């Protein structure tokens, strides 16, 4: 199970926004995806954590930081823009021993 | 960075037809089957598990015994195409495709299923021969819910009673009681939405 909070976060444009993705059973083989939702409710990967490091898809302002306790992660939108406003969620992909997609509930970013 | 795309977020398909839903992914040079994983699922039900370059018919759920397959020929073109045959109302929902090919990503596909009201069964019964009251019935099944409108030769709207139950296909049945004559023509029209669809039947009053 994954949780993703705060459920609703606002900040001024130009400022960082930090959400937490918290996993109940993290292991190092998992891939953790930071996703945005489109209006039709399609998921769109922003960044991915795998093999020790986070990497953005096209904007490095989307930054995943693993916390010292390892099952929790900071998903940071750095230097926010009004356009960053929407719903986000984190998701874990497991390949072994069973294929699994696990998604958290959405949280909302409101950039003012 | 590796990304999966979808041409369509949303499929609207006719009941009992065949469904091909697609997830697109980058494939530069010839397909390396060893590295490729394809996973299709629905409501935590395993549909397709394409691993080490071959479908594992073991880990698949029984609901998709014969009806589900992945189109291998398409993979060499970067198309994870899932064909589902004889689509039923239970097949509506949200599908997820997950592809690992040097990176991994997943996308959601929404499936909506229509069933047209075209098999329209009818019946005409004489209720009282003196005043020539007849009972006219029109029954049909489909999805979603249709209302039924009665019209006469004049196309002047009439007043019937309509009962809607389940089969969850909706079974819609409508009765008109009316005094009429031999050769009078009546129409029953099933009006459904999602999208709009008006399906008519005709009932002609027979000799007494």
UniProtKB/Swiss-Prot annotation, chain A:
Its main location: membrane. Residues 37-44 are annotated as: Interaction with CD274/PDCD1L1. Keywords: Adaptive immunity, Apoptosis, Cell membrane, Disulfide bond, Glycoprotein, Immunity, Immunoglobulin domain, Isopeptide bond, Membrane, Phosphoprotein, Signal, Transmembrane, Transmembrane helix, Ubl conjugation. GO terms for biological process: adaptive immune response; B cell apoptotic process; negative regulation of B cell apoptotic process; negative regulation of immune response; negative regulation of T cell activation; negative regulation of T cell mediated immune response to tumor cell; negative regulation of tolerance induction; positive regulation of T cell apoptotic process. GO terms for molecular function: signaling receptor activity. Monomer. Interacts with CD274/PDCD1L1. Interacts with CD273/PDCD1LG2. Interacts with FBXO38; leading to ubiquitination and degradation by the proteasome. It comes from the Eukaryota. Disulfide bonds join 21-90. One of its GO terms (cellular component) is external side of plasma membrane. Ubiquitinated via 'Lys-48'-linked polyubiquitin chains. Deubiquitinated and thus stabilized by USP5. It is found in: Cell membrane. Glycans are attached at residues 16, 25, 41, 83. Residues 1-112 are extracellular. Inhibitory receptor on antigen activated T-cells that plays a critical role in induction and maintenance of immune tolerance to self. Delivers inhibitory signals upon binding to ligands, such as CD274/PDCD1L1 and CD273/PDCD1LG2. Following T-cell receptor (TCR) engagement, PDCD1 associates with CD3-TCR in the immunological synapse and directly inhibits T-cell activation. Thymus-specific. This is Programmed cell death protein 1. Disruption phenotype: Mice grow and develop normally but exhibit splenomegaly, selective augmentation of IgG3 antibody response to a T-independent type II antigen, and enhanced proliferative responses of B-cells and myeloid cells by anti-IgM and granulocyte colony-stimulating factor stimulation. Mice are prone to development of autoimmune diseases. In a C57BL/6J background, mice spontaneously develop lupus-like autoimmune phenotypes, characterized by proliferative arthritis and glomerulonephritis with predominant IgG3 deposition. Residues 1-106 form the Ig-like V-type domain. The keyword rRNA processing does not apply.
UniProtKB/Swiss-Prot annotation, chain B:
Interacts with PDCD1. Interacts (via transmembrane domain) with CMTM4 and CMTM6. Interacts with (phosphorylated) STAT3; promoting nuclear translocation. Interacts with CD80. GO terms for molecular function: receptor ligand activity; transcription coactivator activity. Induction: Up-regulated on T- and B-cells, dendritic cells, keratinocytes and monocytes after LPS and IFNG activation. Up-regulated in B-cells activated by surface Ig cross-linking. One of its GO terms (cellular component) is early endosome membrane. Glycans are attached at residues 18, 171, 179, 198. Belongs to the immunoglobulin superfamily. BTN/MOG family. Plays a critical role in induction and maintenance of immune tolerance to self. As a ligand for the inhibitory receptor PDCD1/PD-1, modulates the activation threshold of T-cells and limits T-cell effector response. Through a yet unknown activating receptor, may costimulate T-cell subsets that predominantly produce interleukin-10 (IL10). Can also act as a transcription coactivator: in response to hypoxia, translocates into the nucleus via its interaction with phosphorylated STAT3 and promotes transcription of GSDMC, leading to pyroptosis. The PDCD1-mediated inhibitory pathway is exploited by tumors to attenuate anti-tumor immunity and escape destruction by the immune system, thereby facilitating tumor survival. The interaction with PDCD1/PD-1 inhibits cytotoxic T lymphocytes (CTLs) effector function. The blockage of the PDCD1-mediated pathway results in the reversal of the exhausted T-cell phenotype and the normalization of the anti-tumor response, providing a rationale for cancer immunotherapy. The keyword Lyase does not apply. It comes from Homo sapiens (Human). It is linked to Truncation of the 3'-untranslated (3'-UTR) region of CD274 transcripts leads to elevated expression of CD274 in multiple cancers including T-cell leukemia, diffuse large B-cell lymphoma and stomach adenocarcinoma. Disruption of 3'-UTR region is caused by structural variants that stabilize CD274 transcripts, leading to overexpression. Increased expression in tumors promotes immune evasion and tumor cell growth by allowing malignant cells to escape destruction by the immune system. Residues 2-208 are extracellular. It is a single-pass type I membrane protein. Residues 116-204 form the Ig-like C2-type domain. It comes from the Eukaryota. This is Programmed cell death 1 ligand 1. It is found in: Cell membrane; Early endosome membrane; Recycling endosome membrane; Nucleus. Its main location: membrane. Highly expressed in the heart, skeletal muscle, placenta and lung. Weakly expressed in the thymus, spleen, kidney and liver. Expressed on activated T- and B-cells, dendritic cells, keratinocytes and monocytes. Disulfide bonds join 23-97, 138-188.
């Amino acid at each position: 199970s994954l949780t993703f909070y705060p459920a609703w976060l606002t900040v001024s444009e130009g400022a960082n926004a930090t959400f937490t993705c918290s996993l109940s059973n993290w292991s190092e083989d998992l891939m953790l995806n930071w996703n945005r939702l489109s209006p039709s409710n399609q998921t769109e990967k922003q960044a991915a954590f795998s093999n020790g490091l986070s990497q953005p898809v096209q904007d490095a302002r989307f930054q995943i930081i693993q916390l010292p306790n390892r099952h929790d992660f900071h998903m940071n939108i750095l230097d926010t823009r009004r356009n960053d406003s929407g719903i986000y969620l984190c998701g874990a992909i497991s390949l072994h021993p069973k294929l699994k997609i696990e998604e958290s509930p959405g949280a909302e970013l409101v950039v003012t | 960075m590796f990304t999966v795309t979808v041409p369509k977020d949303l499929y609207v398909v006719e009941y009992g037809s065949n469904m091909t839903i697609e997830c697109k992914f980058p494939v530069e040079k010839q397909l390396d089957l060893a590295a490729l994983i394809v996973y299709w699922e629905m409501e935590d039900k395993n549909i397709i598990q394409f691993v080490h370059g071959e479908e594992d018919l073991k880990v698949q759920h029984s609901s998709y015994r014969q009806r589900a397959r992945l189109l291998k020929d398409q993979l060499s073109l970067g198309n994870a195409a899932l064909q589902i045959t004889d689509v039923k109302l239970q097949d509506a929902g949200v599908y997820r495709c997950m592809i690992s090919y040097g990176g991994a990503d997943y996308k959601r596909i929404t499936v909506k299923v229509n069933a047209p009201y075209n098999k329209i069964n009818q019946r005409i019964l004489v209720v009282d021969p003196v005043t020539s009251e007849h009972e006219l019935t029109c029954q049909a099944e489909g999805y979603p819910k249709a209302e039924v409108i009665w019209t006469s030769s004049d196309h002047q709207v009439l007043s019937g009673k309509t009962t809607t139950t389940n089969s969850k296909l909706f079974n819609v049945t409508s009765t008109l009681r009316i005094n009429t004559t031999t050769n009078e023509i009546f129409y029953c029209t099933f009006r459904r939405l999602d999208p709009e669809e008006n399906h008519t039947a005709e009932l002609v009053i027979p000799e007494l």
